[PDB]
């Protein structure tokens, strides 16, 4: 005699057969799943007059809780049930409308960009509708669908109303990005690109997934802003942060130029009150807005190791201090070079300077290591220059201690970023990184928010799904599609800050990485830790960079090289294979299989459409769409528990049934050596950097505490193999 | 063995107590009831072998300063002169200052003085200005004055600590700079007259003028008012202007009430608005990012309407019982209230809260049109389609007064009073905010960029009349001419880092001239604050002040032209403050107008005013110490006030007036004080930094009841009080 409340507000007798019908449809083709089990977990929570939507959410939750090693197919059962509900939420029915009718209505509501109706005819929308396979929504895993409804699908962030479905997302991303292409080839690209992303061969980032089709055009994930030593630059930097955080971007801030506490201002008219009060101002700029209504804003701030306030800056995330000297809600990257490590190894002292007191030292730190060492030792001997001496061991230990405590103190090897780089340090040095330490681009400080002479670096991302290819030669066509889409995006999107448009239009920097690398190694029967994957990694990432360059080179023939191509090492006929750190020759003997010399000349002759092409991002969120292992990281477990706005999610490794023994889980590794070696080998070909993690299990160490010696050893090992940056440090609980 | 001292050059010589004694005799000349032996004994015991001669001098300064008392007040002059002696050595290497011209040349060469001085004046003119100077006026400072001189005002290295000048050089060059664009026929006559006025303490100058005017950095406006719009572009523009102006000696008043509430849709729902508090935090770090020109810390007051949707969250931002996520403690706040809000309180009704983005026209009418506000308010209160929240008026007001009592830093602005009794036409240029210390009330316009030419930032330049230095009220005629001319010339002389600020300054040319030594003034007339015995005297006094201020600015309009936007003032329509004051004042004062305001009215309507505003009563907490004045209109805490460390300051003429003063905690309540404020406000163009005071021990169970807090609040409104500054609670 129990009643349920329908969508129209009316009530009718409960019908358990209707629910069974829906469960049957979602369980089609699945193995080792039980409808009864979901029913048992669901029926008990029903009550008189329960809303029909609350019933649907109950059975989704019930199926999601049953995701396990014994029955992994619950990941599709839970996903499909969620898909069913999302259809009702968006369309009021299961079957999606015609694409054209959908677009017209959505443009009328102001949810889609007007250009869609201007750039495509009704005939073309009907033709694009034939490209769409809505049954591909039944190929998602549960974690994927939660990211879709939570972040990616176009929706009202106040109401919660869903406006679209996954395949409309995919086709309109493709339609918008190729909207400026000639009608002779346009739809052919739209279809090819739609297939590539909807069948998970190419992975798209969050701001593209949630942005490309909306009236707000900003799809770059990474924004790099260099701050100058003036109030005008600090104000400009702060404004650019607020504007770009609110428009879907994560921020990298370089504030190393700012003079130290106690420095004179205007000849001594003022006493400099320090960097920390300005860091706080950058922090509130980041936390002032949400990231385009999708997630919270975040930033990583960079400063040199030899900065005079470095001992104060290193403990900014430490919870044991007053608010006066704590800036906890930002991450930090300490910038290091060969000389600093040398002082550590020789057990010597490091001299701290304010960049305002040492002419030329800051610039040489990134561009010229010989000049740096000349100026550094010269200023160390100058009594007239304000300075402070610290033991290198104590300084490094403090850094690694804070890195261990928080996990969010990062390292950037600035010499590696410039000796092995797509840029000439004498023309455009790399002086910072981004939020997740995989981006390395040239920048220039601003004197105003609208300063035409400043440069903010933008990087637009994507990733190759290494688990979705049978041969490395598939990367060629995939690279062409990826490069063309991201490069066309640069002309398509808008730029709230003029200095950012400068860097984007001048360099056209792309950052394309990989996902499902752990799955990839598992299929080849290799491991992270023992070194069995060294040569396979070398072979694999050679193919990736080669086809990326080849695609960008061909696109230069068609549309012209980027305006500032002559500032690259590529322009001088220098390739990544020429400048890598030679210690890599001791850990890999895989030969080059592709014709780089023919490629070298073609680049030297026609140039590149893009100054950078590769960067290995963590893909923490975006990789969940294809149920991939994120980036290059090994999974935590066969069934991982990840975070979400709704609650906890269970995510299964791809093909657990056949590869349960093939995977090497994160905490099954003896140490970081094997991992750091793979990262170094990757870096040989990667244009920018890699979001490299370090991992430590306290229980594997005596007295349950990781010795400082081990931390410093892995740090030096990373530098030895040319690793440019270090991201998270994970400490097991 | 013999005890040695270390000289300045690093050498040593046998200690000579006679040298110290001789220095003490020079500083004690003409003083009474002081003992050199007392100072020497306290100093000698702290001496040690090889003691630096400069540490010797600092010791005898401390010794004299510790003997400052009611019994022997002249130690305040003993300690000061000793401090002046030492400051001479630091700046010149000797007691006697160099010739003015040689000093200026060297300081310009060192980059400590502005280049224009050597361009605008000849060597002959500097030698002539040197004849105006009386360096012996340095011996007329009190100790607190000299501590502010060496600490904040004298040109010095903020990293080194090196002093570069003395007080009379400060005074002569402030005058020389401000009148530097004057015709040579009258220029040096203005320089001498103005130098005499400030060095003999007739006119009091504010901190950024005292520490700024002669330096290469030209920004001397004390108050900067920035209105923020509901957009990121405006928020970014506001943040930039704050950082720039704090760094250049200014205090900030922020209007952030237009910002839509937490939960509001953005771009039709593309985003969820995360609230005002994260932006308030961004403003706080902007204020605290810089020092104020190297002199003191940055500070700001932020303003919002009482009917804002987040008002309950905004009111507790200084409350120390919360996580950092919803606490912005290092800023002050001004709650904006009007008649309709008070009515709901008195009637025991509800107040409806809105986000200004959801109530078209309500925010503007809140300041400009009380009739239209009530129409829109009641209309929107019944609209179900409009997001809203209802709160009992009693509970909302109690929360506000609770946080005001706990912190002392939650302020009140009666926005209707600020626009019905104003030099500005609310239909053209409404007053929508105040400043840091709640005495400034000027028009603003939000910016869309830091370089936006269509925005308006309000700047106010300050000064004060020393009421304890005048013999008759007609001496204000001369002093007003000097004060107005100096501040008006300053506007063309100084620079403007933000274009929107230059717009308001050049367009309205708003000045804020107040008073100091008011407590000393009442004491000389045998009046008190509390009983109402000074109501008519206050009326008579502040009538003369505003009249002579308007008259000075009216004459200045004839000579140089009225301000560009004079047409936006009530003065332009022939309306005077004596026409628009709150009528309840007629019940607490029957003093007639002694000056010809009708003749002035005709003159203003014809020739205009050089300045849109002229009067504002600032607290003058720092600047008043220079003349050893009682600060502003506030009564002293004691005969010896304790304000490097601790300072002792004696009220002027303690010997003859110890019985005439009425100390702060000798008062029954705030009624007598609030009536004086209301009477003052009748003539004041802008507002007054009005304090409320409470002694818990006078109340049952040692706690001031909310009913009493609300009574004083309503009393202030009753008498047309525009703003409320500090609430002081006795310990
Ligand atoms: N009478 C019912 N008794 C039990 N479950 C029901 C009943 N009607 C619908 N459900 C279940 O509720 C869930 C949500 O279905 P649905 O979104 O179609 O709700 P609805 O009220 O039927 O909507 P509409 O009337 O627009 O079709 C489904 O799992 C469906 O099987
Ligand atoms: N052909 C289908 N294949 C898969 N899922 C479907 C199909 N048709 C409908 N669904 C989904 O199943 C759920 C229930 O659909 P539907 O409203 O038709 O049934 P019901 O609500 O149980 O019954 P009714 O609403 O007619 O009382 C919805 O979430 C809908 O999107
Ligand atoms: N009042 C202040 N308080 C604290 N820091 C300040 C202040 N003014 C400027 N700074 C800092 O001093 C540095 C220089 O400031 P800025 O360049 O804008 O002024 P400037 O006139 O060029 O002086 P300088 O010639 O010394 O550089 C910057 O790091 C800025 O943040
Ligand atoms: N991502 C964001 N997170 C939080 N607050 C935001 C964000 N973007 C904008 N805001 C706030 O929303 C308000 C409106 O923003 P703004 O005017 O700059 O953008 P807009 O495109 O004009 O949007 P709208 O048309 O809704 O006004 C401002 O108060 C601003 O601070
Ligand atoms: N030999 C001394 N013994 C004791 N007190 C002294 C001696 N010389 C100076 N003083 C006192 O020290 C204080 C500081 O005086 P002053 O600045 O002139 O020091 P100084 O070393 O004598 O400098 P300078 O050489 O420039 O005259 C004064 O009170 C002075 O009387
Ligand atoms: N004529 C004066 N009137 C008042 N104070 C003076 C006079 N001459 C000097 N002083 C002050 O007295 C202090 C001491 O002056 P001065 O250096 O000449 O004497 P001293 O330090 O005691 O002895 P010494 O000759 O060893 O320096 C200084 O602070 C100086 O400014
Ligand atoms: N929570 C996050 C995650 C990523 N990012 C940005 O996205 C870049 C790559 O991160 P990612 O590949 O994990 O991001 P997703 O696109 O996978 O969400 C980083 O450099 C950040 O700039 C961010 O701003 N905020
Ligand atoms: N600590 C202070 C005090 C005052 N002020 C500014 O000075 C104005 C009047 O204060 P005041 O007259 O007490 O300042 P002084 O000139 O006496 O130092 C206020 O409106 C503030 O804008 C400031 O910026 N910082
Ligand atoms: Mg139904
Ligand atoms: Mg500078
Ligand atoms: Mg001496
Ligand atoms: Mg807007």
Author numbering:
A (entry chain B): 4 to 736
B (entry chain A): 3 to 645, 649 to 736
Sentences from the paper on this structure:
We also confirmed that W28A substitution does not alter ATP binding in site 2 by determining a crystal structure of W28A α2 with ATP as the only effector at 2.6-Å resolution. We find that the W28A substitution results in a more open pocket for ATP binding at site 2, but no structural perturbations in the bound ATP molecule are apparent. All site 1 residues and site 2 residues F87 and F97 adopt analogous positions to those found in wild-type α2-(ATP)2. Therefore, the W28A substitution appears successful in uncoupling nucleotide binding in site 2 from the identity of the nucleotide in site 1 without substantially altering ATP binding to site 2. The hydrogen-bonding pattern that affords substrate specificity is the same as that described previously.
Class Ia ribonucleotide reductases (RNRs) are allosterically regulated by ATP and dATP to maintain the appropriate deoxyribonucleotide levels inside the cell for DNA biosynthesis and repair. The α2 subunit houses the active site and the allosteric sites, and the β2 subunit houses the di-iron-tyrosyl radical cofactor.3−6 On every round of turnover, these subunits come together to form an active α2β2 complex, which allows for the transfer of the radical species from β to α, affording ribonucleoside diphosphate reduction. ATP breaks the α–β interface, freeing β2 and restoring enzyme activity.
